[PDB]
Structures are given as structure tokens and as C-alpha cells.
Design a protein around this ligand. Structure first.
Ligand SMILES: [Ca+2]
Ligand SMILES: [Ca+2]
Ligand SMILES: [Ca+2]
Ligand SMILES: [Ca+2]
Ligand SMILES: [Ca+2]
Ligand SMILES: [Ca+2]
Ligand SMILES: [Ca+2]
Ligand SMILES: [Ca+2]
Ligand SMILES: [Ca+2]
Ligand SMILES: [Ca+2]
Ligand SMILES: [Cl-]
Ligand SMILES: [Cl-]
Ligand SMILES: [Cl-]
Ligand SMILES: [Cl-]
Ligand SMILES: [Cl-]
Ligand SMILES: [Cl-]
Ligand SMILES: [Cl-]
Ligand SMILES: [Cl-]
Ligand SMILES: [Cl-]
Ligand SMILES: [Cl-]
Ligand SMILES: [Cl-]
Ligand SMILES: [Cl-]
Lengths: 412, 411
């Protein structure tokens, strides 16, 4: 039997049928539902944490790693973080859904409308808080959702859906079926979620590496769009006119977390200052317990260390001829997520900005800042690396809409 | 080998020249467009001479009257092309760098608009489309790889050599930013949607199965498209519809029978079906169009514009109400455009809330779904899709990708 594929389709049809309820909800109701989720999460701590305790106990009996148990575990900090983010999202602005453009010939007028996508899918790790984060962002943007979480977090996610997410929607006058959670432990569910172009045309993929890379390819092959950043890794180019203090700071502050997509991965150093800056670069790398990878390399120049658990505390270093070579390497050998330049020469920075084609470009600023919250003050839906018009780089809730034109009588 | 090699060569030449266009100021772009208008008129003789040779070859080869018409550049078409170029030259340039805010650590954030890079375009053997597409790509600072139907290749090459490229060179832009595949082979179209790292987006101007095939091939190769393979407007006549309004809508949505946004499927509320039948019949007959009534020998959403022999037809169906009309429109038609005829604002609101297509209309013909008719700027090509990004009519300000930049606050 096709039980896994069947459960995903069922969730999608249920989300689609309920979606009009969310589409027609006024701003006050959407915001009240988000505020209420925050209140319920804190009011029902005992129930939520109890569900989580069972997942944690179950994961330990299966021999889960201490790092993945950390991600599964809901602490007080993460509980209060969840609620604070829900309230921030509730207070965030709603763009105007109908803008009058002009009158047209024949006693008519034109309006540009923002409509929801409909049903958006999401695949992510066994981290309970992600269920609330994703659910809340789709609700804010009037999109129903089909969520797929790592199986180790199912009970936690289901309790959050039951006690936090749904009652809040219902009290605000929204059909609670607009948020669906795939009830299957099977990892195959993720694949089934990117194969329903008629029901779930867009899927948010939160993962990193080979698994996300495969899901993103499978989706594209089935006509399903994604918001994904399978391959990351920031580039930093140290120019001839760089400042020692700034470089030291950039290196240290781009390596605070070694498993993320927007950390420093490839360090390019202008040949003319290599010898002078290496002592500063070495001091900075040592500060973070990171070792340089020098030629001859054992992997491609753009190899992303964050995806190699065993060797994550590593950074690839290359000496380059100038800005033009730095740009070419950045564009041709990396995924085009983020790249920065360290320099005090405005002309060198301008050339780097004009040449680099990635989603975020930086001048004397760490690539670790490429994040929706850090840049825009609103939660990040998930970075997208497409090379075409539409959402790109950090994605936030106002990106999750489709355009529609409406024409009607001028006096109506 | 040779066809795919020529297409790849064109893409690489376009990509290599792109920075010159990307870095050109607004004045240079607009001057280039103005110059194209001037050159089209000034070099009328050479442009028309090349077209006359394409016509002779087409006639000798036995091409149909309709296709010869599309291939023929008339005096009027030439002046229309020049007029459109001047309109586009005067159209505004959106701010490519927007200061968003300051950030911690003495930094500031900018949202930048960058060109897509190289955009492909596949279209029929219509000479003016080469100028239409090339000009809109130039306006949006995108380089282009264009592929036209082989019957117009000569005519298109002459426009590229005499009108497009000298105008670019004259404004300080590398003329190689506009490429025209020099192959007669139809296979070049398929080759054009198989280069994701060079030409990530391709504009498909056709209709029907050929465009549907190219859009699927693009998807299987990781290439994105702006396409509207399927069209056909819907019109729902509500119980509270006005008689003269309905008549006007039917007549004015059937001025052209081969377009994607004409009336195709007419849904009439059950309670007024008998009363409106004489109004609808007379309005269809006035346009030489026959109704297709049940039992049908085709799907309710079958698009007459794609059936040359039966183009002069409109499907008529009786519906129970607004909810049924919305379901049929959403589930059984292309999602391009639907209208409602009614004097009841509550029925209109319900239709507007429920219908999911790219354009929705209240007492207004679906023929208005066009970039020029709505926005007063040329149409790049409608994109019929339902995900974030360009949708409905597409115009030059849609052809960009987002980039964030962070730099020191005082720089
Ligand atoms: Ca009127
Ligand atoms: Ca200093
Ligand atoms: Ca030196
Ligand atoms: Ca130290
Ligand atoms: Ca410039
Ligand atoms: Ca790609
Ligand atoms: Ca066709
Ligand atoms: Ca194929
Ligand atoms: Ca009646
Ligand atoms: Ca019936
Ligand atoms: Cl509202
Ligand atoms: Cl409206
Ligand atoms: Cl994923
Ligand atoms: Cl981050
Ligand atoms: Cl400018
Ligand atoms: Cl800037
Ligand atoms: Cl051809
Ligand atoms: Cl390619
Ligand atoms: Cl096409
Ligand atoms: Cl038209
Ligand atoms: Cl019904
Ligand atoms: Cl039109």
C-alpha cells in the first residue's frame, strides 16, 4: 500500500479546502491568532513539555546523538523565544492587498491585488519550535500549510498543533485545518511532499546538503517550486587595501557557528598583502579553533566545511591576484549565497559589488548577517538561491503571495 | 551537435557582454531605445528589402496567407514599432538601490535590483517581435538570446544588424548583449531551454502543444520560463446581470478569435439562461461565432483559439450559481482570466474572492489582460503560473533578481 504518499495527499487536500477561510480573514484576526498562540504556548507549558519529554525519552532509547537530542529538546529559553517571536510576527505590518492603479478607458478602473499562494509545503528537521515558526509565518501570509517534521519530533509537533496552533486559529474565526502536519514517521514523506504540483506548488526546504539537494531537484523535475539553500558557505575576500582590525573582527565574527550556511567558508587573500595579513588571520582563526586548508586541497575549492561534521572547524584559504579573480572564484566556484570584501578602497568595493552575482554582498561586514531577522526585523522563512525573478536570498512573509490584476467599473 | 553548439555560443557571447549593459546609466539605455526608433525609420529601405526576400521565399515554398501575414512588415507595422520604442524609452527606471535601514556595528542595508543576466526568448516568424523583445531586455538591462521562426531569420538578422546593434554601440553598450540564434532548425528552441547556468529564464511566446513541450523540457533541465501555453477567457453571466452590459462583453471579447484572452467559455446562471439565450445568440452571430452547447464533444474548457478549423466558436454552459461558476473556472480552465457580469456587488465580491486566475474582471472584457492595455508599457509575455514571481502580464520592471548589500554606514 501507498500509506505514506496517501497521508501527504490527504493533508494537502484538507489544507486546500480550508484555505479560503484564511484568505478572507481580516488583519486583526490573523494578528489575534498569533498573539493567542503565544499566550497558549506559555499557558500550556506543562502539556507541551510533557509531549517533548516522551520524544526525548524515545530518541535516547534509539541511540540518538547528544547534538540531535539538543535540537529535539525544548528548554525554557526556547519556549520563551518561541512566544517572543510569535508576538513580534503578530505586530509586523500587513502590506495592502489591493492597490488602485488607475482608471482605464470605458468607465473602468484597475487594481493590483496580492493573493495567497494557497497551500505551501515545508520540510524541516526534528526541532519542535520549527513547527510553530513555519505555521505562524504561513498564517501571517494567509497561506495554508502541509508541514513535515523529522519523525523524532512528531509527538512534540502534534501537541503544539493541537494545544497551541489550532485553538488560536479557531478562536480567531479561522478554520484550524489550514495547518496540517504529516502524521508519518517515514522519511519517504519528504519526497512525496515535492511531487504534488496541483496541490502544493511551493515547498520550503529547511535542510542543508545532499538530502535537501535531492529534494530540490526532484521538485523542479515535477514542476514544484522550492525555497531552498541546499548549498551555502560564505566567501570573504581580503583586498590589498584591507584594515587589519576589520579583518580580525570579520574572521572571528564569521565563525561563531560552524554548522550554518552563512559562515565564512572560503577566505581569498590578495597576493600583495598575504604575508602581512596572515599573522592576523592566523590569530583570528585560532581564536575560533579553526584550521586553515591550504593547497594542495583534498576537495574542490568551494567545498563547504559546514556539511562535513568531522571537519567543520576548517576554512579554505587561497591567494588571489586581485578583485577580478576574487569575483570569478566567488561566482564560479561557490553556490552564490553570500560574499564579502574587506577593504578601505571604495573603488575595489564597488567593483566587487558590481561583479558578484550572489544573494547578499558585504563590505567590511560578516556574511553571518544574511538572515531575515538580522536584516529586516521579521522572521526568516528560509533562504532561497534561485537565479530568476521571485523570492531570493532571505525570504520573509511578504514574499509569499502571487499577483492578480482586477478590473471593475470606475464608480464601483 | 551543431545546433546546440550555436545556441551555447550565443549564450556565452551574451553573458560575456552583459556587464556593459548592467553598468550602463538610464540615459544611455533610453538613448539607445530612441536611436533604434530613429534607425528603423531611417533604414526603412534595407529592413523592408530583407523582409521582401523572406516573403518571396515563403510564397515560393507554399506558406499560408495567415502565416505570410505574420511575416510581413507593413508600413504601419514599422511606424508602430518605432512608436513603441519611443514609449519604452520614456518609461521610468525603478530605483536600483534602495536604502532600507541602518544596522548594528555601524552598518547599513541596501536592497538592490540586479539583472537576471541572460534571458532567452522563443517566438514565431514575426519580424517585429525581435525588436519588441530585444528592446524590453535592453530596458531591463538583461542580455538576450533570441530564437525566431526560420521564415523570418533574414528579416530578423537585418533588424539586429541595422537597427538594434548600432543603437547599442552608439550609446556605449556592447552590441553582443543581443544575440539571435543563426540556425534554421526548430531544435534550437529546445536547445535554448537546456542551459540553466547561462540562460536561467526563457520567455516562450507561443501557444498550445509546442509551448507546453518547451515549458516541460525547461523544467526537466532546471530552467525557468515565462509562458502561457493555455488561454481562453471565461465569462460568468450572473442572475443580476444587465442586458446591454452582457451584450457588449460578448461582442467586445470576440474582436480577435486567435488570441489567448478572448471569450472562450460562457457560463450562465440557471435562473436567467432562457432569458439571456437570445442576447448571447445575437451577440455571437454578430461576430460570426457559433455556440457549442451540450452534449459537448470536447472538454468544457477546450480552447477554441488553438483549433484553427473551429476557432469561431464559444462554449456555453448553464451553471447553478456563483460557487459553481468559480469551481469550473478554477478547476477546468487555464487560470488565465475570468470575468463576471452582474449588478450585484456581493456576487462580484464573491467571484473576486474565489477565482484564482491571473486576472479577474467585473463588467469588463478579459481582452484587457495585457501589459500595454493595463499599464501603458509593452507586454513581455504573460506568465500563467501560480507561485511567487512574475504573473499575469509581464513588463520590464519584473525582469530582475533581488540582492541585499551591507556596507559601512558612512560609505
Ligand atoms: Ca460604464
Ligand atoms: Ca585599523
Ligand atoms: Ca607583501
Ligand atoms: Ca587569540
Ligand atoms: Ca556604470
Ligand atoms: Ca540553477
Ligand atoms: Ca504552437
Ligand atoms: Ca528531453
Ligand atoms: Ca428564467
Ligand atoms: Ca448541472
Ligand atoms: Cl483587513
Ligand atoms: Cl478590489
Ligand atoms: Cl529539507
Ligand atoms: Cl543566521
Ligand atoms: Cl543611471
Ligand atoms: Cl549600493
Ligand atoms: Cl522554425
Ligand atoms: Cl548551462
Ligand atoms: Cl514558444
Ligand atoms: Cl492581444
Ligand atoms: Cl453549487
Ligand atoms: Cl491583447
Amino acid at each position: 500500500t501507498n500509506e505514506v504518499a496517501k497521508a501527504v495527499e490527504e493533508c494537502a487536500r484538507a489544507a486546500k479546502s480550508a484555505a479560503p477561510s484564511l484568505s478572507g480573514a481580516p488583519d486583526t484576526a490573523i494578528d489575534a491568532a498569533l498573539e493567542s498562540m503565544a499566550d497558549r504556548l506559555l499557558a500550556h507549558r506543562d502539556a507541551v513539555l510533557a509531549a517533548n519529554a516522551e520524544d526525548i525519552a524515545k530518541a535516547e532509547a534509539g541511540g540518538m546523538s547528544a547534538g540531535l537530542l539538543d535540537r529535539l529538546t525544548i528548554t525554557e529559553s526556547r519556549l520563551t523565544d518561541m512566544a517572543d517571536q510569535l508576538r513580534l510576527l503578530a505586530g509586523a505590518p500587513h502590506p495592502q492587498r489591493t492597490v488602485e492603479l488607475s482608471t482605464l478607458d470605458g468607465g473602468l478602473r484597475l487594481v493590483e491585488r496580492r493573493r495567497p499562494v494557497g497551500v505551501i509545503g515545508a520540510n524541516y528537521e526534528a526541532r519542535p519550535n520549527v513547527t510553530v515558526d513555519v505555521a505562524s509565518q504561513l498564517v501571517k501570509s494567509r497561506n495554508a500549510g502541509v508541514l513535515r517534521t523529522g519523525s523524532a519530533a512528531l509527538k512534540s509537533a502534534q501537541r503544539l498543533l493541537e494545544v497551541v496552533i489550532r485553538p488560536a486559529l479557531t478562536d480567531s474565526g479561522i478554520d484550524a485545518n489550514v495547518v496540517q502536519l504529516v502524521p508519518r514517521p517515514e522519511r519517504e514523506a519528504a519526497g512525496a511532499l515535492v511531487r504534488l504540483p496541483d496541490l502544493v506548488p511551493l515547498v520550503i526546504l529547511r535542510g542543508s546538503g545532499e538530502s535537501t539537494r535531492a529534494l530540490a531537484l526532484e521538485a523542479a523535475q515535477h514542476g514544484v517550486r522550492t525555497l531552498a539553500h541546499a548549498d551555502g558557505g560564505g566567501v570573504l575576500y581580503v583586498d590589498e587595501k584591507a584594515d587589519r582590525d576589520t579583518v580580525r573582527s570579520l574572521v572571528v565574527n564569521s565563525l561563531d557557528r560552524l554548522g550554518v550556511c552563512n559562515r565564512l567558508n572560503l577566505l581569498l587573500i590578495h597576493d600583495a598583502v598575504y604575508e602581512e595579513f596572515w599573522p592576523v588571520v592566523s590569530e583570528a582563526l585560532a581564536e575560533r579553533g579553526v584550521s586553515p586548508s591550504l593547497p594542495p586541497y583534498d576537495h574542490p575549492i568551494g567545498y563547504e566545511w559546514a556539511l562535513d561534521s568531522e571537519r567543520e572547524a576548517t576554512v579554505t584559504v587561497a591567494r588571489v591576484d586581485g578583485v577580478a579573480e576574487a569575483v570569478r572564484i566567488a561566482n564560479e566556484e561557490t553556490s552564490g549565497l553570500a560574499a564579502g570584501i574587506a577593504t578601505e578602497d571604495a573603488r575595489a568595493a564597488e567593483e566587487f559589488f558590481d561583479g558578484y552575482q550572489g544573494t547578499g554582498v558585504f563590505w567590511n561586514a560578516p556574511t553571518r548577517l544574511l538572515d531575515g531577522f538580522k536584516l529586516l526585523g521579521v522572521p526568516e522563512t528560509g533562504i532561497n538561491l534561485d537565479k530568476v525573478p521571485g523570492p531570493r536570498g532571505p525570504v520573509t512573509y511578504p514574499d509569499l503571495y502571487v499577483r492578480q490584476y482586477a478590473v471593475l467599473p470606475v464608480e464601483r
